[PDB]
Amino acid sequence: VDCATTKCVALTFDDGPGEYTNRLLDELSEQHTPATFFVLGKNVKKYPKTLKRMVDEGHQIGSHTFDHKDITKLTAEGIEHEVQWTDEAIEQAAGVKPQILRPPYGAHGAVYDRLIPYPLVLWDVDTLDWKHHDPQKTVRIALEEAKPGSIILMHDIHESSVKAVPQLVSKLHDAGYTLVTVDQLFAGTDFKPAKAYDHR
Ligand code: NI
Fold first, then answer.
1. Which of the residues 14, 15, 113, 156 is marked catalytic?
2. Domain locations in the chain?
3. 1-200: what fold?
């Protein structure tokens, strides 16, 4: 996909994997749609086959650190642990290395980011599903606030994401968008480590 011309949107899911991730992957599969999963390293240990699904079925795996700590609260070595422990978990699980990282709570800063070997990927559309856990509100906010180049934040922690996705994909397609991984979204642009990006 050429997102320089084509109207692209990236669906992203934080804080997984968990008990709903496979249903989520099933729904995404049913509508031939890729997504980007910013995974928690602590959770990855328990879900190796599910991470293999992400690779096998066209999705992108990103790092969300290991135990979801605000990285700006940490020391240099603390940040090292969060990055490296998560990478090891992802490599052991799926045989790949993430190429992007999303900082917990969106919290970051130049002095910290310089320690992160990947582009920092934020978002421009917060579905707020972490507060309301409501599938229809997730769809409404994602649909109405998305624009070409948007990155939509959702959470793989709760049933409402599973219930939201079939409708969310349908409506984004009907609204003229092509759904892509974060990699595809930034393909061709200057997408470099230790920098933060919230939109193409
Ligand atoms: Ni998170």
1. 14
2. 1-200
3. TIM Barrel (3.20.20)
